[PDB]
Design an enzyme around this catalytic site. Sequence first.
Site, short mmCIF file in Angstrom:
data_model
loop_
_atom_site.label_atom_id
_atom_site.label_comp_id
_atom_site.label_asym_id
_atom_site.label_seq_id
_atom_site.Cartn_x
_atom_site.Cartn_y
_atom_site.Cartn_z
N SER A 132 -2.02 8.57 7.66
CA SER A 132 -1.35 9.85 7.48
C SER A 132 -2.40 10.92 7.18
CB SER A 132 -0.35 9.76 6.33
OG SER A 132 -1.03 9.75 5.08
N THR A 137 -5.35 8.57 0.30
CA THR A 137 -6.09 7.49 0.96
C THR A 137 -6.16 7.72 2.47
OG1 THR A 137 -5.40 5.90 -0.73
CG2 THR A 137 -6.23 5.03 1.35
N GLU A 175 -0.14 18.34 0.76
CA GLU A 175 -0.49 17.73 2.04
C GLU A 175 -1.15 18.70 3.04
OE1 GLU A 175 1.43 13.79 1.73
OE2 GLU A 175 2.63 14.82 3.25
N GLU A 246 -11.65 5.19 28.67
CA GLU A 246 -10.88 5.85 29.71
C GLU A 246 -9.98 6.94 29.15
OE1 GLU A 246 -9.54 3.06 32.50
OE2 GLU A 246 -8.10 4.40 33.50
N1 LIG Z 1 6.06 7.90 9.92
C1 LIG Z 1 5.75 7.46 8.71
N2 LIG Z 1 5.17 8.30 7.78
C2 LIG Z 1 4.87 7.86 6.53
C3 LIG Z 1 5.11 6.55 6.16
N3 LIG Z 1 4.71 6.39 4.87
C4 LIG Z 1 4.20 7.55 4.42
N4 LIG Z 1 4.31 8.47 5.45
C5 LIG Z 1 3.87 9.86 5.41
O1 LIG Z 1 2.54 9.88 4.90
C6 LIG Z 1 2.39 10.95 3.96
C7 LIG Z 1 2.06 10.43 2.57
O2 LIG Z 1 0.82 9.78 2.57
P1 LIG Z 1 0.71 8.22 2.28
O3 LIG Z 1 0.15 7.46 3.40
O4 LIG Z 1 2.05 7.66 2.02
O5 LIG Z 1 -0.35 8.22 1.10
P2 LIG Z 1 -1.61 7.24 1.06
O6 LIG Z 1 -2.44 7.34 2.31
O7 LIG Z 1 -1.09 5.87 0.71
O8 LIG Z 1 -2.59 7.81 -0.10
P3 LIG Z 1 -2.04 7.96 -1.60
O9 LIG Z 1 -1.82 9.45 -1.82
O10 LIG Z 1 -3.09 7.44 -2.56
O11 LIG Z 1 -0.75 7.18 -1.70
C8 LIG Z 1 3.71 11.67 3.90
O12 LIG Z 1 3.67 12.72 4.82
C9 LIG Z 1 4.68 10.62 4.37
O13 LIG Z 1 5.83 11.20 4.94
C10 LIG Z 1 5.69 5.69 7.10
O14 LIG Z 1 5.93 4.51 6.81
N5 LIG Z 1 6.01 6.16 8.37
#
Ligand SMILES: Nc1nc2c(ncn2[C@@H]2O[C@H](COP(=O)(O)OP(=O)(O)OP(=O)(O)O)[C@@H](O)[C@H]2O)c(=O)[nH]1
Lengths: 426, 426, 120, 425, 430
Positions: A132, A137, A175, A246
């Site tokens: 994400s 992270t 974010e 590619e």
């Molecule tokens: N499509 C989708 N988006 C996700 C999912 N889980 C989290 N997100 C998105 O990812 C973003 C949040 O970041 P996270 O990945 O959950 O956070 P992290 O990378 O674990 O890092 P931390 O802040 O330490 O938890 C938000 O925009 C969420 O909507 C998922 O399972 N599917």
Amino acid sequence: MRECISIHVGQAGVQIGNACWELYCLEHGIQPDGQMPDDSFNTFFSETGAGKHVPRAVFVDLEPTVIDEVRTGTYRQLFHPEQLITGKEDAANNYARGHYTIGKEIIDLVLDRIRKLADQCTGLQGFLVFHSFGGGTGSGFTSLLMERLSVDYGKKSKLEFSIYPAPQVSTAVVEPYNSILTTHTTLEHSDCAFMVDNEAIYDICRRNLDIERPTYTNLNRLISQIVSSITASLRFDGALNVDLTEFQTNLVPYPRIHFPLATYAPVISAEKEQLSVAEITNACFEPANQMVKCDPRHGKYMACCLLYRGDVVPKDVNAAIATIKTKRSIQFVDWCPTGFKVGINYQPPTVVPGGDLAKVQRAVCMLSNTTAIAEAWARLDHKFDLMYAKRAFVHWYVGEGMEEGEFSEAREDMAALEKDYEEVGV
Amino acid sequence: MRECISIHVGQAGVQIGNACWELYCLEHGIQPDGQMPDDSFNTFFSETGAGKHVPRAVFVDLEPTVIDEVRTGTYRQLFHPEQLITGKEDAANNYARGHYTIGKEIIDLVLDRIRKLADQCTGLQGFLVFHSFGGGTGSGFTSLLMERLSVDYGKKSKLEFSIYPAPQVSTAVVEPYNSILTTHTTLEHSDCAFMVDNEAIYDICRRNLDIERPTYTNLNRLISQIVSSITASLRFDGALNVDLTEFQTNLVPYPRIHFPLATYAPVISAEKQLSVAEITNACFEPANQMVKCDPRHGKYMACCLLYRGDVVPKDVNAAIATIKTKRSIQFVDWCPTGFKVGINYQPPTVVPGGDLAKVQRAVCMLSNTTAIAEAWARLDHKFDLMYAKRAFVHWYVGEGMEEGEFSEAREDMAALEKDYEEVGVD
Amino acid sequence: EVIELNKATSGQSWEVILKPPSFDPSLEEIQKKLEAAEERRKYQEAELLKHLAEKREHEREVIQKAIEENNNFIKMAKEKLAQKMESNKENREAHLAAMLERLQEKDKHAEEVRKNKELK
Amino acid sequence: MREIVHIQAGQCGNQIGAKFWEVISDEHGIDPTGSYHGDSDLQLERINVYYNEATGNKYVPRAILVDLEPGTMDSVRSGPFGQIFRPDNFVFGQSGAGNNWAKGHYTEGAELVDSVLDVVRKESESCDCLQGFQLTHSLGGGTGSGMGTLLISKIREEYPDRIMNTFSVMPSPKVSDTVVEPYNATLSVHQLVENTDETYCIDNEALYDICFRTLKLTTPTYGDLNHLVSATMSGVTTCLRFPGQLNADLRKLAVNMVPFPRLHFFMPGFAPLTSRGSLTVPELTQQMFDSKNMMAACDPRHGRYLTVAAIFRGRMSMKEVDEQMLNVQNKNSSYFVEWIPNNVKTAVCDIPPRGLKMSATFIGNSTAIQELFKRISEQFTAMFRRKAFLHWYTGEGMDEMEFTEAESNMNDLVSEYQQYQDATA
Amino acid sequence: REIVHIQAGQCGNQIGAKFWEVISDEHGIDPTGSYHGDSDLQLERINVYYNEATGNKYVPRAILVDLEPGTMDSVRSGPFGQIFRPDNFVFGQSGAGNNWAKGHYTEGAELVDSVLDVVRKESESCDCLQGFQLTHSLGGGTGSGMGTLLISKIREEYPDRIMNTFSVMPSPKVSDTVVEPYNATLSVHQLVENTDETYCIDNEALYDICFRTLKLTTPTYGDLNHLVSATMSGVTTCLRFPGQLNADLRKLAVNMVPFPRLHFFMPGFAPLTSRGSQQYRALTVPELTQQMFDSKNMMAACDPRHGRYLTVAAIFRGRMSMKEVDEQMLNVQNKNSSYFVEWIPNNVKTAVCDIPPRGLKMSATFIGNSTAIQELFKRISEQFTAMFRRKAFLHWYTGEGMDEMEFTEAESNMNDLVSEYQQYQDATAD
Ligand SMILES: Nc1nc2c(ncn2[C@@H]2O[C@H](COP(=O)(O)OP(=O)(O)OP(=O)(O)O)[C@@H](O)[C@H]2O)c(=O)[nH]1
Ligand SMILES: Nc1nc2c(ncn2[C@@H]2O[C@H](COP(=O)(O)OP(=O)(O)OP(=O)(O)O)[C@@H](O)[C@H]2O)c(=O)[nH]1
Ligand SMILES: Nc1nc2c(ncn2[C@@H]2O[C@H](COP(=O)(O)OP(=O)(O)OP(=O)(O)O)[C@@H](O)[C@H]2O)c(=O)[nH]1
Ligand SMILES: COc1cc2c(c(OC)c1OC)-c1ccc(OC)c(=O)cc1[C@@H](NC(C)=O)CC2
Ligand SMILES: COc1cc2c(c(OC)c1OC)-c1ccc(OC)c(=O)cc1[C@@H](NC(C)=O)CC2
Ligand SMILES: Nc1nc2c(ncn2[C@@H]2O[C@H](COP(=O)(O)OP(=O)(O)O)[C@@H](O)[C@H]2O)c(=O)[nH]1
Ligand SMILES: [Mg+2]
Ligand SMILES: [Mg+2]
């Protein structure tokens, strides 16, 4: 043999990884214990002296919760414990925490496991990275990982699949910051990044699958269908996109402009007549089916590929392609040919059994490099400017050792990219 | 833990102590030999190995007469003999005999006994001193003792209970002199002093209790119930408790402004049930004050209400809510809230053969009002009348004093009157 | 215009063209930035523990001041009472000295009255 | 990133502290004997956040109970769940604090504080990864105010990287135990600005006003006020305690709710407001931004929200929750800052609080909180410009300028809040 | 709290003996020293005036002194004569010729060492000596001259002790000895300097009471001494009987003497009776309070309404309502405010002792420190000056070694005393 290595960083990347590897095992007939009753699947799966197939994957998170569900879950036996790497304390939505504070403590370990998978390869193509933009992270550690992977595997491709934040899908206040920061740091290290807009996916789940409030399982299963189309080229003996290089050749004429727009059709509700090659095709140019929200007719095209799947005959395709030329006004930039690369991959589209998608005899995924995707960046840039003019939340980043200067530098890079898109679509 | 040591000086002090300790033994079930059939009473009683409960008290007088009645009376086995200290000759209504000529011969004995009571303490809260303004011993020896206790014990709390002279009750011609002299030398050393106007007690006995001519036992038994209320907080477990420190900080806004007005309700004749509201209101009616003055023409700086008996906090709240509305009751500008509330469960105990009626609930208010300056004004005027002619001064000079001390003491009283004027300024 | 690209076991690819174009760091640099960020984190933490240390010192200065205040209140009380008690002693002893001297001067006079009686 | 260590200091701190444990022990199915008798395993999923597992599979609160006075912790021990608490975690002195912040912070508190820090240092070593500390205390008295802020300062020195979160009760002349409350509250707000990461402002002025005006209670008692406080503390922690959509801890909350370090004082709200003994989603959404529901006696329509967290408990469609929360936002746009996008966040939890089939809890970081501090500041100046009751503080070794420094800083916090009230985009 | 009683000269031993007769009866002591009484209140403060002898007897702490051996045989002759310790009888062989200088300087000085021996022995038998009281006349030579010498010598040895005199003032109505104004003026000189409280018993007032009120054509010392003995009983009641009063001689002096030289008390008594005479009606409390600020009931020949009271002590004896007693005493003060100085607040004190004197159901004794007592000192000073202008009888005094100048100084000092009484009589609180 053309091996690829998947890296799944943070919660979003781990849970999309779960959904993809689930689909891959269904597509290749690998059971959850790794047993298996065309040998291109070996690009993604290695094999052990016991006869079991192990994904060429590493799962990384700074917190144990998400990966513990992999360790204890249905596919627990598919991965070896070495491939699942957790810290104890996450990045608290703070890029500088995942990149500078914790990332410094766990990176060499992650590179060590990657170094080991890479040693089981006779011809490594490079890496697929899932994360994400928004998490600490997913943004902070991922961008540290990309820095290091360029140093250790220079001539190797890196493809990103990046979740782009949306207020409709559990986003956090900070974010925009994390998004711009990781995009600054990883731009020169990614060769091709497919952005997935959570709002686009959420819209598609609501409209076509009739789920008023989609779950993460819902979004990730639909995401995996798209990822599967893009990698089916690599996992089966196809003809379009047969190696990671590619993608750059076919979709990225200019290095910084490496953000193609994916479009997938059809998404049919399992709960609710088979569509022609021509109907799924003109449904590739309807913005509703885009993975990222933007208007591609207020942009221009630099590249365009159609990945067909299932029972698709070439004459049907050309029949569809001729029709949309006269029906639709789509514009390519001056210095590009106006046309398409077409791939048919004969493997049928596969849905998770019991899931919310419906099995279809044919499907298509379109990959385009359009300047219209700039307006997704513009949206993030504007939310960044609102908060950064008042320095809101910047103190959390400075407290992890980041310099306030990195904020303006990153934002200046995003400006340059925005006018890069401007210039090529002049 | 939290021990309090009691010092009773001179006839008035010793006789009041008699009434108080007879009341405590009744309130806690201690028979006159100190045997006994919630251990909070240990703040006031130590226990010997044989189960004997012994007051933490010294009785002192320069003449043996009054303490001989103790040494031979009912409670003669309640105190150890070393706690009852007498010289041979009194101070003959002369402060300077109490403070210098006679007192200096017994003062070291008295501190050595006090030191031994303090040595049996693991959390000494402070000293309570009972004495009369008018006696040569009550005035001069208490001044000597307070000076000496400040040397031995530094800033440790010293609280006084002072009998204020009244022509209606065995006062002598020179008592105004002795009252100002003891007030001057004792100001710097006392932390809080509760004055009891003998005329006020006298009037309560004749009005509420229908006693034509009250005796000391009448007066002293009334005083005991009031003292009992103040100390009840310290010898019982209670619902809302107030230690000695909480007293001083909630009632004393400046070091010299430390003379709270005591009010008590109800005072019902034995031969004749009131609400929490009824007794609370009666604490602001001048018929029940322990000093004659008019607070309706003064300003309140702090109020402390101590309830005992069947008292519910919701009823104290509803009753104090009423008091805050009556602007007959004016607080100074700089007191945003001047209410501290004590509640103890045990009703006031009545001495058999006494004149007060057993009641389910009572209250004792300590209020710091500017109006107590009226009582200082009446003493100063009698001082001035006599001092202008230097009447009686030669008795003091003969014992080694200087006229210098008389005007200094009177000037300090002028400044105290001026202090009470200024704290009521808006 | 179609152009065949490749064929394989599980698919084939071609190209369709409608109109032609109108127009014909280092590892040490990385770890340098991370060690610099780490040394900014540790410096801000050093500063915080320094200010907290400064608050510990203030707290034990307040406690010391209350001790000194109480000892100066004992020392003032002690010397003022001594001055008072000795001043009263010198005054009362002087009154007695004067009273005894006046009585003894009278006794001198009475012996003079007696001797004067022996002249007569 | 899981375990919380909880500290309750002073009379007030221990009263609402006990009532809190009484509330969440009932939500998680923990009886007073410490063992579990619930019916959903959702009650055990994050039980470790607030509880330690004992030998006999019994659960023991991760609580440390502190007072300079012995009386209140006899009262805790005697309460309903008095046996649930570890007998070793009671740390009580003998003298009291005399309603005096200087005694709590400098002299009496300093002689008890290290005995407290040993018990803290022991409970934290029994943690896999300690998420942070939470403290309940009043600012009006001497122990929770003075020693509580002493504790916070010394915990920060030993655990620099840990989140400190307080539940701070604000004095009011409507329910005052002591005449020096403005001094005590002002001296410790100084401390909280410096050394906490999140502070939930519990205003006795507001609790009293809710009980009197909305709940039609002629004579509020601390029992009534505490009924509202414990509901709010339950709601505020629902996402720490129960599994849900949210995978978030105290640190992520601080990051997203605190845009500027000093501006970390939160207005708590709750709906429905209930009385001891005795609503629609649209109504729930609306009364949550209503002045009558704020536990801080500030009118939010007097300022603007920097950030807002709302959590809904009970079975209810999230589609209708989100639709009403967006309607309210867009209807009242001038009470949200526009330079923090999407600054109103919403979480839902299926498990309704005991006694109610639906509820909502509100955490807002508002510039209107400056009204609370102005109020403390005017009461401070009314006493201090006459130096009233000051000698009880200088007697403890404090200097006057510690007082002026504390009010100067609190007046700076007010003007800081006002500066973002007026900021444009 | 012991008192040491000294009586000096004819008058001193006559009224001293009458005193012992009266209080011995009040306390249940018979002439042998045995206690034959009804109540223990008689015994509680018995040690103030009596020593406890072995044999359960009580011996007056009394020292009897005279230069003439005569009257101290008649005291041994008197009823209660055997009660006194024989060793406390210190007498010479030559009288004093009614000559103060013989008492003070010559014959009296030779005998004064022996009386100090007795005083030292009686007082060091005490556990805490209150002080001394002396009974004597001022018109003779032994009581006046040797008596004031004794006071001066007791001052030297017991300077922190209270000194109290019952001093009988001469009058031409009673005695014809023309030099009594000289002896009284020399004596008052000494008393002003060296005693703490002096009760002025004026033979002029005693004569007038007996002649005008008791209708005794030719009063005798016995008639006059009846009124002295009643008064001395009265003013010592609260030393002798436990009552409300927790008090000794020093407490009395502190509250009654506002300026050191002004310590001459005007005693008064009601009702007035002749000796050995049945009273057929006790007075009521209103009668007692009224007849006690009446100039006819004063033992000093001064009209109180000619002056102002500095301080007043009233002692009531008998069974009576302390309600009614304190009622009348306030009345008296209010109706007669202009006779009390306003700059000594609350300057009238009242005690009630249940034990009435022998022969009365109810009595009252008054001790007033009044500026009207200057009418007494002026009368002495006028008589003194009328003789001294002419150097009348001076050779009786210079023949003993005195000088004229000593007479001039004593006249000066007494005129100074009259001046200060007038200064405070004329003082306002303004
Ligand atoms: N499509 C989708 N988006 C996700 C999912 N889980 C989290 N997100 C998105 O990812 C973003 C949040 O970041 P996270 O990945 O959950 O956070 P992290 O990378 O674990 O890092 P931390 O802040 O330490 O938890 C938000 O925009 C969420 O909507 C998922 O399972 N599917
Ligand atoms: N209320 C009350 N007042 C008393 C009592 N005893 C004496 N007083 C008052 O105290 C003052 C007299 O002082 P005392 O206490 O008797 O004198 P002292 O302190 O014993 O000292 P001395 O002068 O040496 O006898 C007067 O105003 C009395 O009315 C008592 O038992 N109760
Ligand atoms: N009231 C009263 N006055 C007396 C009595 N005896 C003598 N006086 C008066 O005392 C004065 C004379 O004093 P005395 O007592 O007789 O003389 P003294 O002191 O014994 O000295 P000498 O007689 O010279 O040895 C005259 O005023 C007498 O009237 C007495 O018994 N009662
Ligand atoms: C541990 O409990 C909570 C923790 C957090 C939040 C929260 O409110 C819903 C909580 O419940 C009270 C939270 C709050 C506010 C936000 O913006 C103001 C945000 O961006 C984001 C959040 C949370 N993230 C999300 C997607 O809700 C993380 C921090
Ligand atoms: C031992 O006998 C007496 C002793 C005293 C007093 C007295 O007169 C009532 C006596 O009886 C004659 C006495 C006298 C006068 C006072 O005011 C003039 C006073 O204030 C006070 C007193 C006495 N005190 C009281 C309360 O009466 C103490 C001294
Ligand atoms: N809301 C609430 N406030 C309280 C309670 N008890 C005391 N307070 C408030 O806390 C302040 C007094 O502090 P307190 O805790 O009694 O003193 P401490 O023990 O020294 O901390 C005043 O504002 C009180 O009104 C309670 O149970 N609930
Ligand atoms: Mg995470
Ligand atoms: Mg006494």
